[PDB]
Amino acid sequence: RGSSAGFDRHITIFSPEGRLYQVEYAFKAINQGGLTSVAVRGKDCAVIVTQKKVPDKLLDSSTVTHLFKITENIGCVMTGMTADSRSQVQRARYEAANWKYKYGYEIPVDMLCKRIADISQVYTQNAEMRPLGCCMILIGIDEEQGPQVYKCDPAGYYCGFKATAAGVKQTESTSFLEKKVKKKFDWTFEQTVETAITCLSTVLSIDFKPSEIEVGVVTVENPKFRILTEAEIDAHLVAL
Amino acid sequence: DRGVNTFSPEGRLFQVEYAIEGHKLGSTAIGIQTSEGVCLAVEKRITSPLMEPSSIEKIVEIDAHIGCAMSGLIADAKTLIDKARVETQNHWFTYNETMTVESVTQAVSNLALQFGEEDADPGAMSRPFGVALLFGGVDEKGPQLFHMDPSGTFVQCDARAIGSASEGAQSSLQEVYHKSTTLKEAIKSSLIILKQVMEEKLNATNIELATVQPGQNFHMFTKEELEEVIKDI
Amino acid sequence: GYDLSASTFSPDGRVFQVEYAMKAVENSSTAIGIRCKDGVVFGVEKLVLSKLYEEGSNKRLFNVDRHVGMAVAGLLADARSLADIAREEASNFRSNFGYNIPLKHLADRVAMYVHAYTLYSAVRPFGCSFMLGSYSVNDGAQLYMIDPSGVSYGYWGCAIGKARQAAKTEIEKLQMKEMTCRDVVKEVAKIIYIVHDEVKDKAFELELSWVGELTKGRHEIVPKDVREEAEKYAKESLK
Amino acid sequence: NQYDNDVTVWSPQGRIHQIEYAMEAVKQGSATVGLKSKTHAVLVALKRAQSELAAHQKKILHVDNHIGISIAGLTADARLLCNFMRQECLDSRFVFDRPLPVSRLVSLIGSKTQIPTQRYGRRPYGVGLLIAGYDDMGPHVFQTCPSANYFDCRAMSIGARSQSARTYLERHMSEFMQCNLDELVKHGLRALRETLPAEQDLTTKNVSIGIVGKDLEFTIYDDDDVSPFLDGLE
Amino acid sequence: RGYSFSLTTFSPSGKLVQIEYALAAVAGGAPSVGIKAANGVVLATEKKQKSILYDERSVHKVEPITKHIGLVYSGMGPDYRVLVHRARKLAQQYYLVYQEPIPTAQLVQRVASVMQEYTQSGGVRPFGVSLLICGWNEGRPYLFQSDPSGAYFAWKATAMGKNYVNGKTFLEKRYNEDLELEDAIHTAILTLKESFEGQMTEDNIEVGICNEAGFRRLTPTEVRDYLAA
Amino acid sequence: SVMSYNGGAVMAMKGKNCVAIAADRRFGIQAQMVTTDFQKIFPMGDRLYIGLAGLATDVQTVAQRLKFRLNLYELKEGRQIKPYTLMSMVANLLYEKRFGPYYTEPVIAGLDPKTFKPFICSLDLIGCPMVTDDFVVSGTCSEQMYGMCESLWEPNMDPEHLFETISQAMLNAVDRDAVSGMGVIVHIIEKDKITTRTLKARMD
Amino acid sequence: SRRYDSRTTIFSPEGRLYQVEYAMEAIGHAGTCLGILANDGVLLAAERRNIHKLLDEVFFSEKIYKLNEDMACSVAGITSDANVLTNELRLIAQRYLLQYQEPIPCEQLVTALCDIKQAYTQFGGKRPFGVSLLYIGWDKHYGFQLYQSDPSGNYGGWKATCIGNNSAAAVSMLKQDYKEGEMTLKSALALAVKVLNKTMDVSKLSAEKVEIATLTRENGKTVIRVLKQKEVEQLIKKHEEEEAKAE
Amino acid sequence: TTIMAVQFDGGVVLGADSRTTTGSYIANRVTDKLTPIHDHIFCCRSGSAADTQAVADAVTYQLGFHSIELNEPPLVHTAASLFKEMCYRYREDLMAGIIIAGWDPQEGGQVYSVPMGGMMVRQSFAIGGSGSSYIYGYVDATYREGMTKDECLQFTANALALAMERDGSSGGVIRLAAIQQSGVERQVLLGDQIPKVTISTL
């Protein structure tokens, strides 16, 4: 299909088609971990859910988390390479603190997303380093708009969504969520946790136990980013 | 393909191994150490009769008691000669005394191997030098003669020969030399071997000769005395 | 042509340079760690190549701070470089904030440093993995493990080295959540002697260390009487 | 056939061929031998026959009043390292008004040697060492490698054909502690005699001897100062 | 710390194939169209989202630079964002020195100088995007276009992205020099309509205008009325 | 003071579609005259002049740097500069040296290149631009020409009456200053003409 | 890294510089430009390469670039590099004027630019500019002049030169119709028109495929004036007439 | 300026006046000299207003980052050490005397002094500012070990009133702040509620 000429498949230079193969490989690196995330935003809430598959039972699973806190009201979930994602979380925390220090108020979700995206665009251009092999999803409450859900990628593209899904089963996990934004605003009430868990389970057939997921929450009633307990998760799971 | 710093399956440093081969294409020189001084002698290797022979200077003076004779890349040798002169003058300035042949050879040998192409210096060398040297002089212990390589290894000799015919020049120097010479028999034999190995005819303008002895300074032979010596032989 | 740089994804999204720096560890002698209620216990099978060396050369247990131990596996020169970096990190923390650094923070700092060497063509990834361990009246015992890629997780017992497979399999049958260090030390001796190969390698040395409440939170080396007894017990158990 | 050029490329087996080659460089040199007793440490070297006319070499150098080394490999790199060690000991005496422990010196040497082995466009130091010193804790016979790891040993020999000297050493290590200085030095000269081929025996100008101890600084023994040591080797 | 050698070099025939390949990249973006009328300019794009999940409001392709300049693109969005940021900085510096709004021609010259710097420095690739600039100053409307190499032109009606050949082949016929801005919008929309493979909607396209009062992008409520005809 | 070390006096006045600028000629050192043909007014444009007063070395330096920048601007843009734009550029140049500044106080007078509307302005040593509608002054006899202009100025004047007023003001102003005089030169910038004159003054 | 380096600044096994040899062939295919020197001034005459109907002629020219009050140039090759070079030339002229308070001479300008062009061929790792220039001017010492540079960085004064496409045949026919010392500006214009008419593959000129500038001294002042379409049309008509009459 | 803080079992009490002068003129008379460094840590400011504002901002930013990455509430000792580092590094250019007081789950309420110079010390109660010199004997003769919250509030209010009635650079209203494990309490004691002490007559 797309021919090659020179050092195309080794550095970030244009192919005879203008394709940048070395960036199409970080997308495949995203599917290396073997997890899947799903974020859904509602009329007054944003929710994150994340698979929690520990390999075997000697790890202290209280440390194996894919959910992170950036500021009090912003939360995030990573997917891809672990150390890459740790470095990206550190960068986002520093950006969010510097914004407040410079301008006197708290950074918005779209501004933080755009900052991370232009930081990655530079890895797409210079030839001495490589792109980071990880994806990112953010949620938060905007005092003017309300709930927000954004996603970056290793190429520097940072669109905004109504309901996302990243990971190994991305295509079908979005094909499922496609059918349910038809009516009822995708169940726009505090129980979109039902929708998220159902969408994660439909194409995985696990019917998860009370401790193989993580969920996070922001609300308009309480804006801070909270991580729900096992009992709370179990009750929702029990209802299912 | 490779870099400049790259060992081989025998740990040999390719670039130094090539700079060493760059010496078997030079004109032969000879030094000899006696109990009464040292003598240096080098072939001039004139190309065509239109070239002035007084313009080939292969035996320079480092200081009033040290001289040097080179072979290889005469363009490269000049930075080494300049730095040796500067170091000797610094030593005089600081300690109010003359340096030593050992110290000069050692300080000059520390410039070799100081090359590279990343995080080296603002302006640094890109390859090894291609000159072998021969120092002579007198100091607080007597006449001494040293030898230097592009790898940076300096030794102390009493009769050394460097150049493109050395594997044949030493085969005679080892038979001629003895620990009971005088500088005059030294000079005679150093001339006989040159004549033995050269391609032209050893006359009084295509060679060079200088001597240092405990009494005098570094002194170069004249086209008067040189001619007399050659004729006398 | 994708095997030569840490700036080249394979057509399938892999980094073979890190994959090779991992083999570098995946064929080195074994070291284990065990977490307990009271504290932590490190144990390493130190190899003695020839008689000529003094016993005590090539130690693999360091002291990163007055409450943090460290066990290593892989290239010992890279390991010593990392140990200096960690000592540097702990000292700066104390000079900035006036108290001792948490193990969670130290491991995070060192893992970021290790990961920075996986992105560029001007450097190469480290070739050693290591374990940490502390004890604080605040958070109790702890244990971490960092890879050549820079991933750091918490554990209850880890088995970096070459006999990781056989080491982990035997350590999982232990019930460490209720034991104590005096009762664990013996188990570490026994499991290392079990996992040890006595054909390829003929002679091996054994050194132990611990940090807990009995040492008042200071990392130490196991005294000589405890060690001799532990060795005897292990031998008796082995048959 | 593409992993053997740069020092920052792993092989599919997790090895660094450049560091290897830099070690095979060190094996080219002439053998050395060191060992220690209860109160003295000793170095003995074999100055190689360069030609029929040249003074042999310098293979043992002073580092400080209590430390001395003996090299095998690239002499330029060897004296580049010796200058760093000398500055280290001088700096120590300036700040704390006391000497330096040999262990901390070897730590600094290893940390300095390791950095080149990791960056692009650089190469390892192609020289092996053998250190001897005296301190509060007695003698020390450390040994270093082009790959920056170092060792501690009762007695070690490095160089070409030193396998026989190493075998002799271990076979006779049982008595090095109790032995006297004269006895200690001879044990060294016999071991060094082992590596020489059949056509040559130790003479009086192709051997050097260094000595450091309790009440004695580091000294080197010249061409005919080694005569009181070679009188009995029948 | 970075490469110091060029990645774009000459070929045995004198070509620069890295720039040719950045142009091949541009030839695969989304269609763009600009048309200069007697009292204003018009930019019209194809903002077609992949699926219904994507929130359309969050990202825009028609952006302002000052109160009287705006631009669109075709090619690569992450590169377009860098160019937009540096253009805004360039305009602010000019206003700081002269206390006057920058003219469109000076803006285009400085932007093309940056794009040219990225063809001859060490260890970088060229941008994969072409621009379409709009402006109005001193009682006159302007319309330029910038290439990945650093060469800029000036047009009366142009077209980028996919199917640009047929785009300008169709654009030449209808274009009149007396055309009003409101009747130019119909032609801009119609040109886009020729190659859309779908059904036009108030969220499939973006439209910006520029006249005496400044730059602004039309709102979907107005794009609806304009699409009704 | 440093700005009283070479003397000098500049003046600009506005009329009905016309501007006028004037200066004195004396060049001297503390208490001794050297020459009497020193130039203090520079033609920055077709109908755009600038007058500098203060330290003569800085007068020359600032004039030369300004000509540098204006040539570059008119080559890059493709047209002539406006009086307002020139004032901002000069203020920027003077403010770049806020600490260790030039000792010179400029005066600008021109005509709008398309509406032919006058413009006068003066700046302080650090670059503070104040635009007026009657007149500006600068120099060592500032108070004297203030007193003259306030009394003699009228609105909507012809070029003739403008010339008479600016000349009659400069004469009596410098007749009471010790370090100014030796003659006066007057430029009259009309729409299609630029008339220059030299007055007869006192030489003591 | 060494693997990706292209080594733009090295010698060839025969002493050549391949990047410069390739930039010259790049300049080979550009639009035709030609200059002619006369007794009372110089003239340039380029060829318009972009003839699309939908373009805009806002600029007073396409390839002229007045550099100073007394000089002007014209380019062939890559427009993007041409812009950098033109900015540099303007800066050099203004620095000279600031230091000496007199206008710069043409040879000094050409020299200061060719130094920059040469420094791109010896070190740095970059590629060289693919641009050739022609200059015209007037100074105190030598009066009307006409020079030419090339990518390598060597120049030379001429009396009637030509770069671009088919410049070989252009110079060939220039050699047989130029007579030293007797040419006036009008005969210069005639020869320029009649050379451009042939060395362009099109049937006949169009007065919009061309672009013509002159340079004269009038009342102690230099005047650089681009000719207009009507003037060019009149010149073409004159050429059409006399040529037709002969045969 | 008169700032003050005293320690009780469970938290501390802070206090300050509200007047900002310039020579002999009152530029601001409703100043707020108590600033929040974190959710449970405060600081009282005295000296140069620009210096103290800049240092409070820098410390706030550093401490927020430190705590967000360590994933727990910070310590009063950490805050005091960051303050001391900055004040000692810029000891010749700045003019700031600070009092740091707060609550942490590990030691409760503490009070730290950082006078101009950059030295640190823990204290039970601390006074600082221009008017604090007039009430040294009073705090020496009134303090008694193991007081409660209301007794601390009364003690602080009376001391501050006595300072304001004699110092010419102090006055306005009193602002108090008792910090505990529950949260922060802010009140103002203005006008007629200032505790009047008897003035000698005749």
Whole-angstrom Cα distance, residue G84 to residue G93? Answer: 15
Whole-angstrom Cα distance, residue D11 to residue G216? Answer: 73
Q: Do A86 and C14 touch (CB under 8 A)?
A: no
Contact H55, H44 (CB under 8 A): no
Q: Do E6 and G8 touch (CB under 8 A)?
A: yes
Q: State how beta strands E205-211 and B71-72 pair.
A: unpaired
Interface of F with E (CB under 8 A): 76-77, 84-85, 88-89, 92
The Cα of G69 is separated from the nearest Cα of chain F by a number of Å equal to: 10
List Cβ<8 Å contacts ≥24 apart for B166-171.
B166/B28, B168/B197, B169/B28, B169/B30, B169/B193, B169/B197, B170/D51, B170/D53
The 3-state DSSP class for residue E144 equals strand
Nearest neighbour of D154 by CB, restricted to C17, C24, C54: C54
Helices (H), chain C: 16-26, 76-97, 103-115, 164-171, 181-195, 224-238
Residue closest to E81 by CA, chosen among A24, H168, A126, A114: A114
CA quadruple F66, F69, F71, F74: dihedral sign: negative
Query: How many inter-chain contacts (A to C, CB under 8 Å) are there?
Result: 84
The CATH code of the domain that includes E186 is 3.60.20.10
What phi and psi values does residue A24 have, to the nearest 5 degrees? -70, -10
Name F76's bridge partners: none
| Strand residues in F128-199 grouped as ranges (E) | 129-131, 135-139, 184-189, 194-199
Whole-angstrom Cα distance, residue A88 to residue B58? Answer: 65
Give E35-84 as a 3 state SS string: EEECCEEEEEEECCCCCCCECHHHCCCCEECCCCCEEEEECCHHHHHHHH
The 3-state DSSP class for residue E170 equals helix
Under DSSP, the state recorded for B115 is: B
Helices (H), chain B: 14-21, 77-95, 101-109, 166-176, 183-197, 225-232
Whole-angstrom Cα distance, residue A42 to residue A49? Answer: 14
For D69, the enclosing helix (H) or strand (E) is: strand D67-70
- Tokens read off for H106: 């590990």
Sheet strand arrangement including C140-146? C61-65, C68-74, C128-136, C140-146, C152-154
Q: Which domain holds residue F120?
A: 1-204
Interface of B with D (CB under 8 A): 1-3, 5-13, 109-110, 112-113, 116-119, 147, 151-153, 155-160, 170, 173-174, 177
The 3-state DSSP class for residue A77 equals strand
**Experimental approach taken:** cryo-EM
Q: Do E13 and G25 touch (CB under 8 A)?
A: yes
Whole-angstrom Cα distance, residue E204 to residue E48? Answer: 5
Q: Do E9 and G29 touch (CB under 8 A)?
A: no
Whole-angstrom Cα distance, residue G42 to residue G138? Answer: 9
Find the largest Cα–Cα distance for chain C: 57
Nearest neighbour of C98 by CB, restricted to H66, H70, H78: H78
Whole-angstrom Cα distance, residue E45 to residue A115? Answer: 25
Using CB atoms, which chains have 3+ pairs under 8 A with E?
A, F, G
Whole-angstrom Cα distance, residue E17 to residue D231? Answer: 81
Q: H89-108 burial string, b = 16+ CB within 10 Å, else e?
A: eeeeebebbbbbbbbbeeeb
For E227, the enclosing helix (H) or strand (E) is: helix E220-228
Give chain D positions within 8 Å (CB) of C21: 10, 14
Sheet strand arrangement including D40-46? D155-156, D32-36, D40-46, D207-213, D216-221
Nearest neighbour of H81 by CB, restricted to C98, C102, C105: C98
Under DSSP, the state recorded for E118 is: T
Residue closest to A161 by CA, chosen among A70, A69, A78, A38: A38
Which residue of chain E is at minimal alpha-carbon distance from F92?
E97
Name B42's bridge partners: B29, B208
Architecture of the A1-240 domain: 4-Layer Sandwich (3.60)
Q: G226 touching F, CB under 8 A?
A: no
Give chain E positions within 8 Å (CB) of F92: 97
Cα B117-B119-B124 angle, rounded to 5 deg:
55
- Tell how far CA D119 is from the center of its chain: 27
The Cα of E90 is separated from the nearest Cα of chain F by a number of Å equal to: 16
Contacts of residue A66, defined as CB under 8 A and 6 or more positions apart, other chains included, come to A35, A37, A50, A52, A77, A78, A79, A214
Find the largest Cα–Cα distance for chain H: 65
The Cα of G4 is separated from the nearest Cα of chain A by a number of Å equal to: 8
Contact F55, F5 (CB under 8 A): yes
Contact E182, E168 (CB under 8 A): no
Which residue of chain A is at minimal alpha-carbon distance from G1?
A128
| Strand residues in A84-185 grouped as ranges (E) | 134-142, 146-152, 163-167
Give chain D positions within 8 Å (CB) of B155: 50, 54-55, 57
Length of chain C: 239
Which residue of chain C is at minimal alpha-carbon distance from A11?
C8
Contact F104, F62 (CB under 8 A): yes
Find the radius of gyration of the CA atoms of chain D: 18
Q: Do C153 and A83 touch (CB under 8 A)?
A: no
- Tokens read off for G215: 């340079």
Q: What are the Cα distances from residue C95, in Å, to B21, C83, C89, C91, C98?
A: 58, 19, 10, 6, 6
List Cβ<8 Å contacts ≥24 apart for F149-158.
F149/F11, F149/F13, F153/F13, F156/F15, F156/F16, F157/F15, F157/F16, F158/F15, F158/F16, F158/F18
Contacts of residue H181, defined as CB under 8 A and 6 or more positions apart, other chains included, come to H10, H11, H103, H105
Tokens 């005819």 belong to residue: B201
- The ranges assigned to domains in chain C are 1-239
Q: How many domains does chain E have?
A: 1
Whole-angstrom Cα distance, residue B210 to residue B59? Answer: 8
For B133, the enclosing helix (H) or strand (E) is: strand B131-139
For D114, the enclosing helix (H) or strand (E) is: helix D102-114
Helices (H), C98-214: 103-115, 164-171, 181-195
Length of chain G: 247
Give chain A positions within 8 Å (CB) of H57: 101
Whole-angstrom Cα distance, residue F50 to residue F119? Answer: 12
The 3-state DSSP class for residue E174 equals helix
Q: What are the Cα distances from residue E116, in Å, to C238, E65, E143, H126?
A: 75, 20, 20, 65
Q: Do chains F and G touch (3 or more CB pairs under 8 A)?
A: yes
The 3-state DSSP class for residue E96 equals helix
- Tokens read off for F93: 């140049």
Contact A212, A51 (CB under 8 A): yes
What phi and psi values does residue B186 have, to the nearest 5 degrees? -55, -50
The Cα of E124 is separated from the nearest Cα of chain A by a number of Å equal to: 5
Instruction: Report the half-sphere exposure of D29 (CA within 13 A, side-chain side).
Output: 26
- Tokens read off for D197: 């081929």
Whole-angstrom Cα distance, residue H164 to residue G50? Answer: 84
Contact C117, C126 (CB under 8 A): yes
Residue closest to E75 by CA, chosen among E158, E162, E137: E162
Per-state percent for chain F, helix, strand, coil, to nearest 5: 30, 30, 40
Give chain A positions within 8 Å (CB) of E17: 5
Q: Do chains A and B touch (3 or more CB pairs under 8 A)?
A: no
Instruction: Report the half-sphere exposure of G86 (CA within 13 A, side-chain side).
Output: 24
Q: H73 touching C, CB under 8 A?
A: no
The CB density around residue B115, as the number of other CB atoms within 10 Å, is 17
For F168, the enclosing helix (H) or strand (E) is: helix F159-174
List Cβ<8 Å contacts ≥24 apart for G198-203.
G198/G169, G198/G173, G199/G32, G199/G162, G199/G166, G199/G167, G199/G169, G199/G170, G199/G173, G200/G32, G200/G47, G200/G166
Length of chain A: 240
Q: Is H148 a catalytic residue?
A: no
Helices (H), H25-71: 49-70
Residue closest to A48 by CA, chosen among A199, A234, A220, A209: A199
- Tokens read off for H123: 């204290």
Per-state percent for chain A, helix, strand, coil, to nearest 5: 35, 25, 40
- Tokens read off for B199: 């391609």
Domains of chain B: 1-233 (3.60.20.10)
Give chain B positions within 8 Å (CB) of D74: 151
Domains of chain D: 1-234 (3.60.20.10)
- DSSP calls for C55-89: BTBS--EEEEETTEEEEEEE-HHHHHHHHHHHHHH
Contacts of residue E189, defined as CB under 8 A and 6 or more positions apart, other chains included, come to E44, E200, E205, E207, E226, E227
Contacts of residue G53, defined as CB under 8 A and 6 or more positions apart, other chains included, come to E172
Whole-angstrom Cα distance, residue C55 to residue C68? Answer: 24
Give chain C positions within 8 Å (CB) of H69: 105
The CATH code of the domain that includes F148 is 3.60.20.10
Give chain A positions within 8 Å (CB) of E124: 125-127
Q: Do F68 and G91 touch (CB under 8 A)?
A: no
Whole-angstrom Cα distance, residue E51 to residue D128? Answer: 67
Which residue of chain A is at minimal alpha-carbon distance from H64?
A97
| Strand residues in chain F grouped as ranges (E) | 9-14, 19-24, 27-29, 32-35, 41-45, 48-54, 104-111, 118-123, 129-131, 135-139, 184-189, 194-199
Contact G196, G32 (CB under 8 A): yes
- Assign a CATH topology to domain C1-239: Glutamine Phosphoribosylpyrophosphate, subunit 1, domain 1 (3.60.20)
Q: Which of C89, C94, C95, C97 to mutate to test the interface with H (most CBs of H within 10 A)?
A: C97
Residue closest to D123 by CA, chosen among D26, D6, D203: D6
Contact G211, G46 (CB under 8 A): yes
Interface of E with A (CB under 8 A): 1-3, 7, 17-18, 21-28, 51-55, 57-59, 77-79, 81-82, 85, 123-126, 128
The 3-state DSSP class for residue A124 equals coil
Domains of chain G: 18-246 (3.60.20.10)
Q: Which of H1, H2, H52, H156 is catalytic?
A: H1
Q: Do D156 and C52 touch (CB under 8 A)?
A: yes
The 3-state DSSP class for residue F127 equals coil
Give D130-173 as a 3 state SS string: EEEECCCCCCECCEECCCCCCECECEECCCCCCHHHHHHHHHHH
Q: Do E54 and A156 touch (CB under 8 A)?
A: no
Which residue of chain G is at minimal alpha-carbon distance from A8?
G4
Domains of chain H: 1-202 (3.60.20.10)
Contacts of residue D203, defined as CB under 8 A and 6 or more positions apart, other chains included, come to none
Q: Do E99 and F85 touch (CB under 8 A)?
A: yes
Give chain G positions within 8 Å (CB) of A127: 4
In G147-166, the residues whose Cβ lies within 8 Å of chain E are none
The Cα of F141 is separated from the nearest Cα of chain E by a number of Å equal to: 32
The 3-state DSSP class for residue G66 equals coil
Per-state percent for chain H, helix, strand, coil, to nearest 5: 35, 30, 35
Sheet strand arrangement including C31-35? C157-158, C31-35, C40-47, C204-211, C220-221
Q: Which domain holds residue E181?
A: 1-229
Contact B60, B67 (CB under 8 A): yes
For B201, the enclosing helix (H) or strand (E) is: none
Residue closest to C107 by CA, chosen among C123, C125, C129: C129
**Resolution expressed in Å:** 2.7
Contact D23, D15 (CB under 8 A): no
| Strand residues in chain A grouped as ranges (E) | 36-41, 45-51, 67-71, 74-80, 134-142, 146-152, 163-167, 213-219, 226-227
- Tokens read off for D209: 């001897």
Whole-angstrom Cα distance, residue G151 to residue G129? Answer: 6
Give H66-93 as a 3 state SS string: HHHHHCCCCCHHHHHHHHHHHHHHCCCC
